[PDB]
Design a protein around this ligand. Structure first.
Ligand SMILES: Nc1ncnc2c1ncn2[C@@H]1O[C@H](COP(=O)(O)OP(=O)(O)OP(=O)(O)O)[C@@H](O)[C@H]1O
Ligand SMILES: Nc1ncnc2c1ncn2[C@@H]1O[C@H](COP(=O)(O)OP(=O)(O)OP(=O)(O)O)[C@@H](O)[C@H]1O
Ligand SMILES: Nc1ncnc2c1ncn2[C@@H]1O[C@H](COP(=O)(O)OP(=O)(O)O)[C@@H](O)[C@H]1O
Ligand SMILES: [Mg+2]
Ligand SMILES: [Mg+2]
Lengths: 384, 394, 183, 723, 73
C-alpha cells in the first residue's frame, strides 16, 4: 500500500528494471526479518491470540455513547445514552485519531471504558442534496446557444479538465457564475449538461427551500451546506431560483423579512468569507435578476454574468429538429408554419407542443403524428 | 525487448508485498479497531492495569462548600444532590465552588477537579490556523493600515512605549465602507501577522432558535477570552446582530436586541474585560446603534473609501505581477478608465483579460486584451455595479 | 432484516429470536390520515375525466414501452381543478388503487413529521420512502402547497433517476396560482 | 550507436545509454571512449538530456559502475560542450569515489578556463562553505590582482554577504532583535485545567536558556536580554553554567567581527564551567571563517590550563568545530597528544576523537593509530559503558567517510579483531564509508548477520548501532529508498521488535529527513502520545524531542503544544521539562536558516554529516540528559549553510530578481520543450525563502546564463538579442 | 482635565478653549480626545503635549469624511 510512487521512465529501460529489483530486496529482507519473530518467539499465533485477548477484554454487551471532549492521556469525559456522563478511560486498541467531539463510540458494559469507535451512518440530508447519477443527454441536446455553452465550460469544465492553461498564464479561474433570462429559455437545461459531463460531486438546492419556519434555522442550513460541499471533493454547488428567497413571503416563517435578511448575510459570508475556501465552484440561476441584493453580485462572489435571450427564429428551427428527432413524424407537417406561431415562444413551448401532439395520437392509437395534431396542439398549449 | 520480462517481475513482487503483509496483521478492515502492531503496550500489562485497578469516577458539579468542615454540596445531571468528602490524593484548595469534579460510584467522594464546559459551538470559532494574506497585498490604503496597525498589534508587540508615557491605548475599532473595498481582506492580514488568539465571529451565527440562547453565547465567548492573557476578537457583518432599538406595537425583532445589549455590557462598565481588543467590520454603519458607536467601545472609525488614482495603479501592480504579460503595456492608462471602481473589480479585470489570451491561442496578454476586458467588466456589467446605492450607505 | 424487532436475553445481551414485522412508517402515516379508499364503481358520471387520467398515469406504468414507440418524454405531473365537492380526492384515490400504487398524500402536518425525519429541513426527504415503494403517487390538496409542488417538480425533472413517481395537485380557482407553475 | 542519433533525433537518444551500458558493463570506458568522441561531434543541443539521463543512471549503480560511469560523465560539458560551470558542484560527485586528485585535477581545470570572471566567480563560490573548504592555498599564484584575489572574497567576504543576509535583508522581512515569544506561546496551560503557577522545576531553566539561545541565530545579538542566562550563570547548575555560556556562540553565529568581544564581558569569572563554555563558544562564532582567530592563540591557552574538569574538556571541542572544514595537519598534531596523553579524564578522551574526526576524512592513518592504542589500553581491560562506544569509534568513521571501495572495511575490521564489545566498532567504519549510493548487497549484510537472535541483553547496543548504520543509505538515493525504508521500519522494528524498535529505531526519521511530510510525521506520534510508560520511558521521550528535530517550521505546534499540555502533570518535569521545550524551540529556531539536510544543488552532500552524526550517536540512551550530553545537546550540528537562493550578486548588487518558486520537477524524457515544474502560482523578486522541494526559474529574457543547474549565488548576467 | 492627569502636559493648554472647540460631545468623547492626543505625540516622538495635539485629536473623534474640499471661501 503506497509503497513507491515513482513510475516516471515508462519504457523498457534498465532503470525500471533496477528500481523494482531494489524494492524486491526491500520486501524479502523485510519478510525474512519478520519471519524470524515466530521462529524464535512463537509465543502466540497472532492471527487470533492477540485478537481473542482483545475480544475477551471487550464485553459482549457493548453500549453506545457520545464523545464531548478528550484529555489525551487516554481518558475522556464521555456521555452515556441516557444523559449521565462519566470520566472513563480509553484503551490502546482504540486508534486514538478518529475521535471528534460528537462521534458515536462503543463503551464497556462494566466500567464503561471506551473500547472502540463506531462508523457513523450518515446522512439523511447529504443524500438529499447529492445528485446520484448523471441526469440526461449531452451538450448536443441543447442547440442554438453556442456562445455561453463555451462560457460555462470556460469557468467550470475547462478549469477542471485542463489545469495547465491557467498556470502557463499564471492566473486563477473566475469564481462565480450566474445565469439569468426570461422563464423557459434553458437555464435549468444547461445545468444538467454540466452534471452530465463533470467528474466532480454536484450539489443542488432550490432557493425556495432556503427559508425555514424556526428562528435561526435558515442560516444554520447554509453553514452546513458549504460544510458538505467542502468536505467531499472539487465540487459544484448549484443554487436555482434564488430570487424566490425575497419575493414570496410565507406565513410559516416566524421571523419576517428580517429573517430572510439574516440568512442572506450568511450566504453572503460563505461565498467570499475570510476562511480558506477550497475548490468549490458556485453556479446560480434566476429569472428576476433585478430584485436581489447587489452586494451578492459583486465581483469576488460572482464573476461571470450570463444572459439568456429568447430563441431566435433560426435557432427555433434547430429546437424542433431536436424534440422531433426520435418520433415517427408523418410527412404532412411543415415545421416552418409552427415557428412563427407565437412571436416569442420559448424553448419550453416547443417541447410543450411536441409532447402534447404525441398525446393526441394515442387517443386514436396511431403511430405517426399528422398535421391536425399540431393544429389543435397549440390551441391546447398556448391559447387559454 | 524484455517486454513481459520486466512486467511479470514487477507484477509478482507487487503481489508478494501483499502476500506476506497479510501474514503480519494490518488486515481485517475494522469497525473501529486499531492497527494490530500498535496496541501491544496494553496487551497484557495495561489491560489489567488501566481496567482492573482503575475506576469509573462519574462527574458532577459542586454547589457550595461550608465552614468548619469539608461537607461539600454536590450536584449531578438528573439525580439528587449529595453531601460528599474529598480523597487523600487532593488538597481542599482547588475544590472551589461551582466546579466540575469526578466522583466514584459507591462512596460518592471527590477525586479530581475538571476543566469547565466550553460549549462547543464557541470552540469551532477559534481560528487555530493562519491565512496567507500579507500587508503587501493591501496596497492603496497605506494610511488606513497604519492607523489600524497602531491599535491592534503595537500595544501587544511593545507594551512599554505606552505605559511609561502613562496612556491607556484604545481598544475597539470598526472598519466600514462600500462592499468589495478591502475590509475582510485587511482583516486577514492582521490574523496573519499577530500572535495572540484570534477568535472570529460572524454576526449571523448568534441568531438562535430559543429565547436568550444567543445572549449566553456572548458570555462563553467573553469568559474564555478573559482567561487568555491577550485575545483578539473579530466581528464580521454586525448589521445582523443589531441595528437599533425601535420597538413599536407588536414586539418584532425584540429577541435580537437583547443579544445586542449583552454584547454592550461585556464591553463597558463593572470590572471590565481587561486585555481584550475587538474589531468590527460592517457594510452599512448608519443602521448601527448610538450606544454601540460610543467610544470606549468602538474608538477608531477607519474609513475604506475608493482608491483615488495611485491606489488604483498600485492594485493593478499587485494582481498582475504574477501573470504572463506583454512587457510594454502601461497600467496608468488603465486606471484612468476606472473612475469609481473597487479593488475587487480590478482583480476581476486582470483575471478576465488573461482569459482572452486563452480564448484564441496565445501565451501572453496584450494591451488590447486589457481593453477588451475593461469595457466588459466596467461598462458592460455596469447594470449591476453594486456601489452607487452603497456609497450613500442605504 | 434491517428495521426488524428481536428478542434479547439480558445477562449477556445475546440475540434470542426474531420478533416479527412491526410496521412500516409509511403504513402508519396513511393510517393517521385515513383517506377514503375508493374505486371506479363509486364514480358518479365522470366518464371523460377517467379517460383523461388514465392516459397520463395508467398507461406509463403498465406500458412504458408505448411512449418509446412515439419517442416522447413520459409525463410526470397532473393538475386537477374544479369547485370543491366534485370528486377530486376520490378520483385520485381510484387511479392509485386500480394500478397498485402507494397513494401517498402530504399535508405538511406535524404528527406526520415524526415518520419522515427528525427535522426534515427540506421537503425532499419524503422521496426516501417514495423510492422504496417505487410505483408511488404523491398527492397534494389545495400558499404553502404551491411552494411544495415546485420543490417536487424540480427534483423529478431529470435529477431524479427512479421512474414511476408522479405528483398530483388538486385545487380550485386556477387563475390565482403561481405563474412559475403556469410555465 | 550513431544510428540512434541519425534517423530522427527522438527520445531514442537515451537508448544509446541503453546500448553503451549493456555492452561491457564493467569496462564501460572502452565503449564510452568510442562514444565520447562520437558525441563530441554529434550535437550541442542533444547534450543536456543525455547528460541528465547519465546522472539519472549515476544516482545509484554498482560500485565499479559508479566508479566508471561518473568519470565518463565529466568531459561531456568540457569536450563536446563548454557549459563548464557545473564542474565543481557535480564533480564533488566525482571527488571521493574515483580519486581525490581527480577533482583536484578538475580544480586545476577550474583554474585553466580563466574566462573571464562571471562563471569564474560562481564556480568557486561553493568551494568555501557549500560542499567543502580546504581550498584556500591554491589561489595565491602569480596573478594576485583580482582574479586570484577572489579567494579572500571567496573565504569571508561573501560569507560576510551571508552575514549581510541577516544584517540587512532579514531585519527587513520580519525579524526583531528579540522575538522571544515562543516562551510566551506557552500560554494557556494555567487556564487549561484549573489553575497554574505549579511547574517550579530547576531543569526547566535549562530549556529557559533557549528562550535566549535558539531564537537568536542570524544576528540575534542581545544586550541585557541574556539576563535569564546571566542570573542563572551565577545561581546553580554547573553544566548549565556551561550551557548559558555556549548559547552565546549561537547568538553571534558566522561572525569574526565582534564575537570575541562579546565573550570577554562574561568570560572573566574564574570558573571552570563559565569559561570553558564561553571559550567553547569561541569556536562556534568563527565556524566557517577559518581566518586568524586562534590557530593556537586562545583555545590552546584554554587547553594548557588543564589539571581538572572542562578546561581540559571544553577547549578541544571548539577548535575541531571551527576547523572542521580545515585539513590543517599542524594543530591536528597539536591535539594528537590529547589522545596520546593517557590521562584518565575519560569524557575528555571520548570527545578527542570526536574533535579530530571532524577535521579530516581522508589520510593521516596515525590518527587511526592514535585512537586504537588508547582503545586497547582502556576498553580491553573493562566491559563497561557506551561512553567508550558512542565516542571513540565515532571519529574513525569520520576519518574514513564516503567511499564504497570496501578497502577501509578490510583495514579497520581486521584492526580491532577483539571481543564483540570492542567489536561494537565492526559496523562503525563499515558503513560510515558508505553514505550515499546503491549497494543493497551491503544492506543484506547490515541485517542478516544479527537480525534478532533474542540476545539476552548482550549486543542490543550493537544491533541498535547496526540499525544506526541503516539510517544512512536512505537520505540520498534521491527518494528511492526513502519510501522503501518507512515501509520497512514501521512493520519490522517498532511494530514487531523487542529492543531495537521500541528503544532506538525511531532515530532513522531524524536522519531520513528534516523535510516534513505527513506519511511519517503522522506515523510517529502514534508511538508518542501513547507514551509506553512501561519501558524506560525516556526512550520514547528521547523520540519526543528528536521528532521535533525537523526544521522548516510548520503547523506542528499543534502536535507539540497538545503534548506540552499533557506533558505538565504527566510525563514529568523532573526529567523532561528541559526536553519538551527543547522540542518546542527547535523547529522555529529563527524563521529562516534551516538547510541542514545534506542535499545541495540537486543532491550532493556538503557534510554536514560530520557535525550532525555525533549527536544521533549521543542519545544512546540515558544519563546524558543531565551531565555529559549537555556538551552535545546544545551545539552539536552547526553546519547551517543557511537558507535562500534569491540573491542577485551583480557587481553593484542593485538588481533584485525575477523569480518564480515551484514544486520539484518531474521530467525524465518527455516532449520538447520539456515542462520543468508546475506550482507557478507563487512569483517573487527578492530574498524570500527556499523551502522543501523548490525549483526556482526566471523570465524577462534575462537568460540566467550563469550556471543553469541550481546553486543559490547566480551572478545573474543579462542579454537581450531577442527582439 | 481629569483624564489629562497621568500625561505629561505642557502649560500651554487652555481647557476653557478646549471645552469650547469641543461642542456636542459627551463624557466618553471628551475622554476619547485625551487618549488620541496622547498617541499623536508618540507618532512624532514628542514627550509633552501641546495645544494642537488636542486639536488634532478632536478631528479623529468626530470621524469626518475627507473629500478634497478646499474650494470654499
Ligand atoms: N434553447 C433550448 N433548446 C432546447 N430545448 C430547450 C431550450 N430551452 C428550453 N428547452 C426545453 O425547455 C425545458 C425547460 O427549460 P428550463 O426549465 O431549463 O428553462 P428555465 O429558463 O430554466 O425555466 P425556469 O426559468 O422556469 O427555471 C427543457 O427541458 C428543454 O428541453
Ligand atoms: N486595496 C486592495 N488591494 C488588493 N486587493 C483588493 C483591495 N480591495 C479589495 N481587493 C480584493 O477584494 C477581495 C476582498 O474583498 P473584501 O471581502 O475585503 O470586501 P469587503 O470590503 O469585505 O466587502 P464585503 O463585506 O462585501 O466582502 C479580494 O479578492 C481582494 O483581492
Ligand atoms: N362525482 C361523484 N360521484 C360520487 N360521489 C361523489 C362525487 N363527487 C363527490 N362525491 C362525494 O364527495 C366525497 C369526496 O369529496 P371530494 O368531492 O373528492 O372532495 P374534493 O372537493 O376534493 O373533490 C365522497 O364522500 C363522495 O361520496
Ligand atoms: Mg428552469
Ligand atoms: Mg467582506
Amino acid at each position: 500500500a503506497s509503497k513507491l510512487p515513482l513510475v516516471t521512465p515508462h519504457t523498457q529501460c534498465r532503470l525500471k528494471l533496477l528500481k523494482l529489483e531494489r524494492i524486491k530486496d526491500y520486501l524479502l529482507m523485510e519478510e525474512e526479518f519478520i519471519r524470524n519473530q515466530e521462529q524464535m518467539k512463537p509465543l502466540e499465533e497472532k492471527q487470533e491470540e492477540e485478537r481473542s485477548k482483545v475480544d475477551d477484554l471487550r464485553g459482549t454487551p457493548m453500549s453506545v455513547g457520545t464523545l464531548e471532549e478528550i484529555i489525551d492521556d487516554n481518558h475522556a469525559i464521555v456521555s452515556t445514552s441516557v444523559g449521565s456522563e462519566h470520566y472513563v478511560s480509553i484503551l490502546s486498541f482504540v486508534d486514538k485519531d478518529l475521535l471528534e467531539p460528537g462521534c458515536s463510540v462503543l463503551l464497556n458494559h462494566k466500567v464503561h471504558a471506551v473500547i472502540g469507535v463506531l462508523m457513523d451512518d450518515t446522512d439523511p440530508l447529504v443524500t438529499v442534496m447529492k445528485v446520484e447519477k448523471a441526469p440526461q443527454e449531452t451538450y448536443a441536446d441543447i442547440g442554438g446557444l453556442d456562445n455561453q455553452i463555451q462560457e460555462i465550460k470556460e469557468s467550470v469544465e475547462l478549469p477542471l479538465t485542463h489545469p495547465e492553461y491557467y498556470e502557463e498564464m499564471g492566473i486563477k479561474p473566475p469564481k462565480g457564475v450566474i445565469l439569468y433570462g426570461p422563464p423557459g429559455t434553458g437555464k435549468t437545461l444547461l445545468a444538467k449538461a454540466v452534471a452530465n459531463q463533470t467528474s466532480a460531486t454536484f450539489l443542488r438546492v432550490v432557493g425556495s427551500e432556503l427559508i425555514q419556519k424556526y428562528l435561526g434555522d435558515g442560516p444554520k442550513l447554509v453553514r452546513e451546506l458549504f460544510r458538505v460541499a467542502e468536505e467531499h471533493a472539487p465540487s459544484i454547488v448549484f443554487i436555482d431560483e434564488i430570487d424566490a428567497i425575497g419575493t414570496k413571503r410565507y406565513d410559516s416563517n416566524s421571523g419576517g423579512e428580517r429573517e430572510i435578511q439574516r440568512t442572506m448575510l450568511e450566504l453572503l459570508n460563505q461565498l467570499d468569507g475570510f476562511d480558506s475556501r477550497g475548490d468549490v465552484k458556485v453556479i446560480m440561476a434566476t429569472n428576476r435578476i433585478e430584485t436581489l441584493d447587489p452586494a451578492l453580485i459583486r465581483p469576488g462572489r460572482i464573476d461571470r454574468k450570463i444572459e439568456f435571450p429568447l430563441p431566435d427564429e433560426k435557432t427555433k428551427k434547430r429546437i424542433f429538429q431536436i424534440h422531433t428527432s426520435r418520433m415517427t413524424l408523418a410527412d404532412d407537417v411543415t415545421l416552418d408554419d409552427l415557428i412563427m406561431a407565437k412571436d416569442d415562444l420559448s424553448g419550453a413551448d416547443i417541447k410543450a407542443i411536441c409532447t402534447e401532439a404525441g398525446l393526441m395520437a394515442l387517443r386514436e392509437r396511431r403511430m405517426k403524428v399528422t398535421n391536425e395534431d399540431f393544429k389543435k396542439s397549440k390551441e391546447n398549449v398556448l391559447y387559454k | 525487448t524484455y517486454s513481459r520480462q520486466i512486467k511479470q517481475v514487477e507484477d509478482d513482487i507487487q503481489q508478494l508485498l501483499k502476500k506476506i503483509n497479510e501474514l503480519t496483521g494490518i488486515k481485517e478492515s475494522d469497525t473501529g479497531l486499531a492497527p494490530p502492531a500498535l496496541w501491544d503496550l496494553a496487551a497484557d500489562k495495561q489491560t489489567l492495569q488501566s481496567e482492573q485497578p482503575l475506576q469509573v469516577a462519574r462527574c458532577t458539579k459542586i454547589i457550595n462548600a461550608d465552614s468548619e468542615d469539608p461537607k461539600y454540596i454536590i450536584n449531578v445531571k438528573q439525580f439528587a444532590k449529595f453531601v460528599v468528602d474529598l480523597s487523600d490524593q487532593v488538597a481542599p484548595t482547588d475544590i472551589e465552588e461551582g466546579m466540575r469534579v469526578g466522583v466514584d460510584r459507591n462512596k460518592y467522594q471527590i477525586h479530581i477537579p475538571l476543566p469547565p464546559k466550553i460549549d462547543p459551538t464557541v470552540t469551532m470559532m477559534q481560528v487555530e490556523e493562519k491565512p496567507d494574506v500579507t500587508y503587501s497585498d493591501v496596497g492603496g490604503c497605506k494610511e488606513q493600515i497604519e492607523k489600524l496597525r497602531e491599535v491592534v498589534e503595537t500595544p501587544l508587540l511593545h507594551p512599554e512605549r505606552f505605559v511609561n508615557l502613562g496612556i491607556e491605548p484604545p481598544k475597539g475599532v470598526l472598519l466600514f465602507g462600500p462592499p468589495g473595498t478591502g475590509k475582510t481582506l485587511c482583516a486577514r492580514a492582521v490574523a496573519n501577522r499577530t500572535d495572540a488568539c484570534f477568535i472570529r465571529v460572524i454576526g449571523s451565527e448568534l441568531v438562535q432558535k430559543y429565547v436568550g440562547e444567543g445572549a449566553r453565547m456572548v458570555r462563553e465567548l467573553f469568559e474564555m477570552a478573559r482567561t487568555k492573557k491577550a485575545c483578539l476578537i473579530f466581528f464580521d457583518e454586525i448589521d445582523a446582530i443589531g441595528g437599533a432599538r425601535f420597538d413599536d406595537g407588536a414586539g418584532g425583532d425584540n429577541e435580537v436586541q437583547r443579544t445586542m445589549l449583552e454584547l454592550i455590557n461585556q464591553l463597558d462598565g463593572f470590572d471590565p474585560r481587561g486585555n481584550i481588543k475587538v474589531l468590527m467590520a460592517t457594510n452599512r454603519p448608519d443602521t448601527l446603534d448610538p450606544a454601540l458607536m460610543r467610544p470606549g467601545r468602538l474608538d477608531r472609525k477607519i474609513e475604506f473609501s475608493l482608491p483615488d488614482l495611485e491606489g488604483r495603479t498600485h492594485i493593478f501592480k499587485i494582481h498582475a505581477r504574477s501573470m504572463s504579460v506583454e512587457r510594454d503595456i502601461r497600467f496608468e492608462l488603465l486606471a484612468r478608465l476606472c473612475p469609481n471602481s473597487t479593488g475587487a473589480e480590478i482583480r476581476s479585470v486582470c483575471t478576465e483579460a488573461g482569459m482572452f489570451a486563452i480564448r484564441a491561442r496565445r501565451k501572453i496578454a496584450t494591451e488590447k486584451d486589457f481593453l477588451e476586458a475593461v469595457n466588459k467588466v466596467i461598462k458592460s456589467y455596469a447594470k449591476f455595479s453594486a456601489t452607487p446605492r452603497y456609497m450613500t450607505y442605504n | 432484516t434491517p428495521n426488524c424487532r428481536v428478542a434479547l436475553r439480558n445477562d449477556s445481551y445475546t440475540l434470542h429470536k426474531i420478533l416479527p414485522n412491526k410496521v412500516d412508517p409509511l403504513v402508519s402515516l396513511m393510517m393517521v390520515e385515513k383517506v377514503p379508499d375508493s374505486t371506479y364503481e363509486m364514480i358518479g358520471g365522470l366518464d371523460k375525466q377517467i379517460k383523461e387520467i388514465k392516459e397520463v398515469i395508467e398507461l406509463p406504468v403498465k406500458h412504458p414501452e408505448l411512449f418509446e414507440a412515439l419517442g416522447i418524454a413520459q409525463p410526470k405531473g397532473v393538475l386537477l381543478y374544479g369547485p370543491p365537492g366534485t370528486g377530486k380526492t376520490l378520483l385520485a384515490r381510484a387511479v392509485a388503487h386500480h394500478t397498485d400504487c402507494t397513494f401517498i398524500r402530504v399535508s405538511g402536518s406535524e404528527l406526520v413529521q415524526k415518520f419522515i425525519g427528525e427535522g426534515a429541513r427540506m421537503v425532499r426527504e419524503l422521496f426516501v420512502m417514495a423510492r422504496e415503494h417505487a410505483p408511488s403517487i404523491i398527492f397534494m390538496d389545495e400558499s404553502e402547497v404551491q411552494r411544495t409542488m415546485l420543490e417536487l417538480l424540480n427534483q423529478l425533472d431529470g435529477f431524479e433517476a427512479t421512474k414511476n413517481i408522479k405528483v398530483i395537485m388538486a385545487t380550485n380557482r386556477i387563475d390565482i396560482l403561481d405563474s412559475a407553475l403556469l410555465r | 550507436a550513431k544510428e540512434w542519433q541519425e534517423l530522427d533525433d527522438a527520445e531514442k537518444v537515451q537508448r544509446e545509454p541503453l546500448l553503451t551500458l549493456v555492452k561491457e558493463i564493467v569496462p564501460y570506458n572502452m565503449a564510452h571512449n568510442a562514444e565520447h568522441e562520437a558525441c563530441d561531434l554529434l550535437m550541442e543541443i542533444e547534450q543536456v538530456d543525455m547528460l541528465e539521463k547519465d546522472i539519472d543512471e549515476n544516482a545509484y549503480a554498482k560500485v565499479c559502475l559508479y566508479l566508471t560511469s561518473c568519470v565518463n560523465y565529466v568531459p561531456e560539458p568540457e569536450n563536446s560542450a563548454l557549459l563548464r560551470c557545473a564542474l565543481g558542484v557535480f564533480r564533488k560527485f566525482s571527488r571521493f569515489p574515483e580519486a581525490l586528485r581527480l577533482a583536484l585535477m578538475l580544480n586545476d581545470m577550474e583554474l585553466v578556463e580563466d574566462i573571464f570572471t562571471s562563471c569564474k566567480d560562481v564556480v568557486v563560490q561553493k568551494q568555501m562553505a557549500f560542499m567543502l573548504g580546504r581550498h584556500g592555498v591554491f589561489l595565491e599564484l602569480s596573478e594576485d590582482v583580482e582574479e586570484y584575489e577572489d579567494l579572500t572574497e571567496i573565504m569571508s567576504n561573501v560569507q560576510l554577504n551571508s552575514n549581510f543576509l541577516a544584517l540587512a535583508r532579514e531585519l527587513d522581512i520580519m525579524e526583531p532583535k528579540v522575538p522571544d515569544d515562543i516562551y510566551k506561546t506557552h500560554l494557556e496551560n494555567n487556564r487549561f485545567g484549573g489553575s497554574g503557577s505549579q511547574v517550579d522545576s530547576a531543569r526547566m531553566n535549562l530549556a529557559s536558556s533557549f528562550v535566549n539561545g535558539f531564537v537568536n541565530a542570524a544576528f540575534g545579538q542581545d544586550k541585557l536580554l541574556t539576563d535569564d542566562g546571566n542570573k542563572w550563570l551565577y545561581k546553580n547548575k554547573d553544566h548549565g553554567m556551561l550551557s548559558a555560556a555556549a548559547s552565546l556562540g549561537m547568538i553571534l553565529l558566522w561572525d569574526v567581527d565582534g564575537g570575541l568581544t562579546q565573550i570577554d564581558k562574561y568570560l572573566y569569572s574564574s570558573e571552570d564551567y563559565i569559561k570553558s563554555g564561553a571559550l567553547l563558544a569561541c569556536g562556534i562564532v568563527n565556524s566557517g571563517v577559518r581566518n586568524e582567530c586562534d590557530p593556537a592563540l586562545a583555545l590552546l591557552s584554554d587547553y594548557v590550563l588543564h589539571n581538572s574538569n572542562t578546561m581540559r574538556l571544553g577547549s578541544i571541542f571548539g577548535l575541531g568545530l571551527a576547523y572542521a572544514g580545515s585539513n590543517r595537519e599542524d594543530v591536528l598534531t597539536l591535539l594528537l597528544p590529547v589522545m596520546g596523553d593517557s590521562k584518565s579524564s575519560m569524557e575528555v578522551a571520548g570527545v578527542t576523537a570526536l574533535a579530530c574526526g571532524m577535521i579530516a576524512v581522508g589520510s593521516c592513518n596515525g590518527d587511526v593509530t592514535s585512537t586504537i592504542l588508547q582503545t586497547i589500553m582502556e576498553k580491553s581491560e573493562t566491559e563497561l559503558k557506551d561512553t567508550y562506544a558512542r565516542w571513540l569509534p565515532l571519529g574513525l568513521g569520520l576519518n574514513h567517510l564516503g567511499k564504497g571501495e570496501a578497502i577501509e572495511a578490510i583495514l579497520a575490521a581486521l584492526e580491532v579483531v577483539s571481543e564483540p564489545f570492542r567489536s561494537f566498532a565492526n559496523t562503525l567504519v563499515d558503513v560510515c564509508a558508505y553514505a550515499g549510493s546503491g549497494n543493497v548487497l551491503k544492506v543484506q549484510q547490515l541485517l542478516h548477520i544479527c537480525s534478532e537472535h533474542f540476545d539476552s541483553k548482550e549486543k542490543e547496543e550493537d544491533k541498535d548501532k547496526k540499525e544506526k548504520k541503516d539510517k544512512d543509505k536512505k537520505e540520498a538515493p534521491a527518494d528511492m529508498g526513502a519510501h522503501q525504508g518507512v515501509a520497512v521500519l514501521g512493520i519490522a522494528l517498532i511494530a514487531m521488535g523487542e529492543e531495537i524498535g521500541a528503544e532506538m529505531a525511531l532515530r532513522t526519521f531524524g536522519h531520513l529527513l528534516r523535510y516534513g511530510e505527513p506519511t511519517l510525521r503522522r506515523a510517529v506520534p502514534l508511538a508518542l502520545a501513547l507514551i509506553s510508560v512501561s519501558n524506560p520511558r525516556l526512550n520514547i521521550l528521547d523520540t519526543l524531542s528528536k521528532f521535533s528535530h525537523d526544521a522548516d517550521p510548520e503547523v506542528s505546534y499543534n502536535s507539540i503544544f497538545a503534548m506540552g499540555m499533557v506533558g505538565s502533570g504527566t510525563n514529568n518535569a523532573r526529567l523532561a521539562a528541559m526536553l519538551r521545550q527543547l522540542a518546542q524551540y527547535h523547529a522555529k529556531d529563527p524563521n529562516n536558516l534551516f538547510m541542514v539536510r545534506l542535499a545541495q544543488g540537486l543532491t550532493h552532500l556538503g557534510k554536514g554529516t560530520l557535525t550532525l552524526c555525533p549527536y544521533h550517536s549521543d542519545r544512546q540512551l540515558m544519563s546524558q540528559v543531565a551531565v555529559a550530553g549537555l556538551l552535545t545537546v546544545l551545539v552539536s550540528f552547526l553546519d547551517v549553510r543557511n537558507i535562500i537562493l534569491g540573491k542577485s550578486h551583480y557587481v553593484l548588487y542593485g538588481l533584485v530578481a525575477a523569480m518564480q518558486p515551484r514544486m520539484l520537477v518531474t521530467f525524465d524524457e518527455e516532449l520538447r520543450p520539456l515542462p520543468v515544474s508546475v506550482r507557478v502560482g507563487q512569483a517573487v523578486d527578492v530574498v524570500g525563502q527556499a523551502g522543501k522541494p523548490k525549483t526556482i526559474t526566471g523570465f524577462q529574457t534575462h537568460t540566467t546564463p550563469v550556471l543553469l543547474a541550481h546553486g543559490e549565488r547566480a551572478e545573474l548576467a543579462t542579454e537581450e538579442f531577442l527582439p | 482635565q481629569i483624564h489629562s492627569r497621568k500625561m505629561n502636559v505642557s502649560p500651554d493648554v487652555n481647557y476653557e478653549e478646549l471645552a469650547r472647540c469641543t461642542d456636542d460631545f459627551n463624557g466618553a468623547q471628551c475622554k476619547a480626545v485625551c487618549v488620541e492626543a496622547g498617541m499623536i505625540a508618540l507618532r512624532r516622538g514628542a514627550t509633552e503635549l501641546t495645544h494642537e495635539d488636542y486639536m488634532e485629536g478632536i478631528l479623529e473623534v468626530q470621524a469626518k469624511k475627507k473629500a478634497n474640499l478646499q474650494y470654499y471661501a
